[PDB]
Design an enzyme around this catalytic site. Structure first.
Site, mmCIF file in Angstrom:
data_model
loop_
_atom_site.group_PDB
_atom_site.id
_atom_site.type_symbol
_atom_site.label_atom_id
_atom_site.label_comp_id
_atom_site.label_asym_id
_atom_site.label_seq_id
_atom_site.Cartn_x
_atom_site.Cartn_y
_atom_site.Cartn_z
ATOM 1 N NE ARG A 39 1.567 -11.291 2.173
ATOM 2 C CZ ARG A 39 2.305 -10.235 2.500
ATOM 3 N NH1 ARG A 39 1.731 -9.073 2.820
ATOM 4 N NH2 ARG A 39 3.634 -10.343 2.507
ATOM 5 C CE1 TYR A 48 2.170 2.812 4.133
ATOM 6 C CE2 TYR A 48 3.225 4.033 5.906
ATOM 7 C CZ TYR A 48 2.900 2.832 5.309
ATOM 8 O OH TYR A 48 3.316 1.650 5.889
ATOM 9 C CG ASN A 100 -4.144 -3.569 11.482
ATOM 10 O OD1 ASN A 100 -3.932 -2.456 11.961
ATOM 11 N ND2 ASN A 100 -4.166 -3.793 10.168
ATOM 12 C CB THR A 118 -0.930 -0.003 1.221
ATOM 13 O OG1 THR A 118 -1.903 -1.043 1.055
ATOM 14 C CG2 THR A 118 -1.642 1.354 1.369
ATOM 15 C CG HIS A 171 -4.641 -9.054 2.840
ATOM 16 N ND1 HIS A 171 -4.483 -7.722 3.158
ATOM 17 C CD2 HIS A 171 -3.708 -9.725 3.556
ATOM 18 C CE1 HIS A 171 -3.499 -7.596 4.030
ATOM 19 N NE2 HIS A 171 -3.012 -8.797 4.289
ATOM 20 N NE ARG A 217 9.850 -3.387 6.000
ATOM 21 C CZ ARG A 217 10.036 -3.765 7.258
ATOM 22 N NH1 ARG A 217 10.126 -2.842 8.214
ATOM 23 N NH2 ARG A 217 10.124 -5.058 7.563
ATOM 24 C CG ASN A 228 -0.395 -8.236 6.968
ATOM 25 O OD1 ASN A 228 0.566 -8.449 7.691
ATOM 26 N ND2 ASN A 228 -0.379 -8.484 5.664
ATOM 27 C CE1 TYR A 286 -5.605 -3.417 7.160
ATOM 28 C CE2 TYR A 286 -3.921 -5.070 6.693
ATOM 29 C CZ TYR A 286 -4.276 -3.762 6.968
ATOM 30 O OH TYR A 286 -3.315 -2.781 7.038
HETATM 31 C C1 LIG Z 1 4.552 0.568 3.288
HETATM 32 C C2 LIG Z 1 3.991 -0.824 3.372
HETATM 33 C C3 LIG Z 1 2.778 -1.152 2.775
HETATM 34 C C4 LIG Z 1 2.280 -2.453 2.851
HETATM 35 N N1 LIG Z 1 1.068 -2.782 2.262
HETATM 36 C C5 LIG Z 1 0.581 -4.076 2.322
HETATM 37 C C6 LIG Z 1 -0.628 -4.428 1.714
HETATM 38 O O1 LIG Z 1 -1.302 -3.603 1.091
HETATM 39 N N2 LIG Z 1 -1.090 -5.719 1.808
HETATM 40 C C7 LIG Z 1 -0.348 -6.664 2.479
HETATM 41 O O2 LIG Z 1 -0.754 -7.813 2.553
HETATM 42 N N3 LIG Z 1 0.840 -6.328 3.078
HETATM 43 C C8 LIG Z 1 1.314 -5.043 2.998
HETATM 44 N N4 LIG Z 1 2.508 -4.726 3.613
HETATM 45 C C9 LIG Z 1 3.310 -5.803 4.307
HETATM 46 C C10 LIG Z 1 4.369 -6.310 3.300
HETATM 47 O O3 LIG Z 1 3.762 -6.942 2.190
HETATM 48 C C11 LIG Z 1 5.395 -7.278 3.899
HETATM 49 O O4 LIG Z 1 4.720 -8.411 4.420
HETATM 50 C C12 LIG Z 1 6.224 -6.589 4.985
HETATM 51 O O5 LIG Z 1 6.627 -5.297 4.568
HETATM 52 C C13 LIG Z 1 7.456 -7.396 5.385
HETATM 53 O O6 LIG Z 1 8.287 -7.602 4.253
HETATM 54 P P1 LIG Z 1 9.643 -6.755 4.112
HETATM 55 O O7 LIG Z 1 10.466 -6.866 5.368
HETATM 56 O O8 LIG Z 1 10.373 -7.317 2.919
HETATM 57 O O9 LIG Z 1 9.250 -5.301 3.882
HETATM 58 C C14 LIG Z 1 3.004 -3.431 3.529
HETATM 59 C C15 LIG Z 1 4.216 -3.099 4.129
HETATM 60 C C16 LIG Z 1 4.711 -1.797 4.050
HETATM 61 C C17 LIG Z 1 6.014 -1.445 4.698
HETATM 62 C C1 LIG Z 2 -0.530 1.434 5.342
HETATM 63 C C2 LIG Z 2 -1.415 0.417 5.126
HETATM 64 C C3 LIG Z 2 -2.857 0.719 4.960
HETATM 65 C C4 LIG Z 2 -1.031 -0.986 5.530
HETATM 66 C C5 LIG Z 2 0.449 -1.061 5.775
HETATM 67 C C6 LIG Z 2 0.887 -2.437 6.130
HETATM 68 C C7 LIG Z 2 -0.005 -3.586 5.783
HETATM 69 C C8 LIG Z 2 0.372 -4.958 6.228
HETATM 70 C C9 LIG Z 2 -1.207 -3.363 4.918
HETATM 71 O O1 LIG Z 2 -1.906 -4.299 4.554
HETATM 72 C C10 LIG Z 2 -1.524 -1.967 4.498
#
Ligand SMILES: Cc1cc2nc3c(=O)[nH]c(=O)nc-3n(C[C@H](O)[C@H](O)[C@H](O)COP(=O)(O)O)c2cc1C
Ligand SMILES: C=C(C)[C@@H]1CC=C(C)C(=O)C1
Ligand SMILES: [Mg+2]
Length: 399
Positions: free
Chosen positions: A243, A375, A251, A37, A191, A348, A194, A196
């Protein structure tokens, strides 16, 4: 600049660079972009950003044969609550998504839409503004005190879904998946992680229901599995992934503190394998690792050492994507990909490195990410992170 105290290791000699088929897609390597996101969608209408989104995804699709999972996309207005996250319910939205999918495909990469439903993580005041409920599994437990307060203040108290309302969400998941495939996506990811809505049903802390959708492992899993079955029938099992984040606390989920948590997720994995043996194997299961129980915490923080996702492999026999603090730990990835059905999600650092796959292959330095622009409504920190070539031209090797 580049990450300072990082010693890169080239991964081109590992299974990370062996092709694999996921659903209908012939991936050329196993570095996956997990859903991220970015809050660049435009209000009103939750429209994928008309100015920058195609460029963002094009940049990150640049290595041929890359699997990209999109940022979470709301299946309906009621499923939403963030004004700047995109949806997949309207013609306006799908027009922009089609451009994004086309761009990714032009780079010979693949795109899976994550279908998102917020439940208690939604902003109750945004929902109230639009005449929508503030939804969750239960109505006597809340994500935090602030969310509970916002709900009551907006005359939009947390609402425990009726069975009819659950069915309505399922219909919306089905239409959203159909919309996604019709617009050109390779598949969808459900999804259920996390914290949701689907995760709120799975977790015994957030789900205190006493009907068929709560009160037992099978009941708590019911909504998630109903969505799986509805989508498999709608668009095919080869176009559907799931997922999960068994150890997540993001959350307000329970994580490893709940002694029954492994059983809860083992049951879901079992039910997926059962369907697989009945000739309907999902394209993949995507797991968030206990390496990252909360993605708002800097890498290395919030690591749970008391549990492992390895149990899933004893149950589910299909591809597994694993995500969580892998970019800074090539030594861990090298071991994990020895398993021949394991893919690695990099979140990230894919934000900050459009050419991450090249860097992983060759053991190149990584661009630091800028959390402040994760964001923000800006091209800055979205489409202006440099490739390694551009970084050198900018003199980052000396910064
Ligand atoms: C800025 C940001 C936005 C994310 N948005 C989502 C999302 O929309 N849906 C989701 O399932 N996970 C989301 N995540 C979680 C990531 O998919 C991932 O599981 C998490 O960042 C850990 O992986 P990493 O250490 O490689 O970043 C988001 C994480 C970050 C940091
Ligand atoms: C900023 C978001 C709305 C969230 C950031 C991290 C996770 C795991 C999401 O699913 C979206
Ligand atoms: Mg700054």
């Amino acid at each position: 600049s580049f990450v300072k105290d990082f010693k890169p290791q080239a991964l081109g000699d590992t299974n990370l660079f062996k092709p694999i088929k996921i659903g209908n897609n012939e991936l050329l390597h196993r570095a996956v972009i997990p859903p991220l996101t970015r809050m660049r969608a435009l209000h009103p209408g939750n429209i994928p950003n008309r100015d920058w989104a195609v460029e963002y995804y094009t940049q990150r699709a640049q290595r041929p044969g890359t699997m990209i999972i999109t940022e979470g996309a709301f299946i309906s207005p009621q499923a939403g609550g963030y004004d700047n996250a995109p949806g997949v319910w309207s013609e306006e939205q799908m027009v922009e998504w089609t451009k994004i999918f086309n761009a990714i495909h032009e780079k010979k990469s693949f795109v899976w839409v994550q279908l998102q439903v917020l439940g208690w993580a939604a902003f109750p005041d945004n929902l109230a503004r639009d005449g929508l409920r503030y939804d969750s599994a239960s109505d006597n437990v809340f994500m935090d005190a602030e969310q509970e307060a916002k709900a009551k203040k907006a005359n939009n108290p947390q609402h425990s879904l009726t069975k009819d309302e659950i069915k309505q969400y399922i219909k919306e998941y089905v239409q959203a998946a159909k919309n996604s495939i019709a617009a050109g996506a390779d598949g969808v990811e459900i999804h259920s992680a996390n914290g949701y809505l689907l995760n709120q049903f799975l977790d015994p802390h957030s789900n205190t229901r006493t009907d068929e959708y709560g009160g037992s492992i099978e009941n708590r899993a019911r909504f998630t599995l109903e969505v799986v079955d509805a989508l498999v029938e709608a668009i095919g099992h080869e176009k559907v992934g799931l997922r999960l984040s068994p150890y997540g606390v993001f959350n307000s989920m329970s994580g490893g503190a709940e002694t029954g948590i492994v059983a809860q997720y083992a049951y879901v994995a079992g039910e997926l394998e059962k369907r697989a043996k009945a000739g309907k194997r999902l394209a993949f299961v995507h797991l968030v690792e206990p390496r990252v129980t909360n993605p708002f915490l800097t890498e290395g923080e919030g690591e749970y050492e008391g549990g492992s996702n390895d149990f899933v492999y004893s149950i589910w026999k299909g591809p597994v994507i694993r995500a969580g603090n892998f970019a800074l730990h090539p030594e861990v990835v090298r071991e994990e990909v020895k398993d021949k059905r394991t893919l690695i999600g990099y979140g990230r650092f894919f934000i900050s490195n459009p050419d991450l796959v090249d860097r992983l292959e060759k053991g190149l330095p990584l661009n630091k990410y800028d959390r402040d622009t994760f964001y923000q409504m800006s091209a800055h920190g979205y489409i202006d992170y440099p490739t390694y070539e551009e970084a050198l031209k900018l003199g980052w090797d000396k910064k």
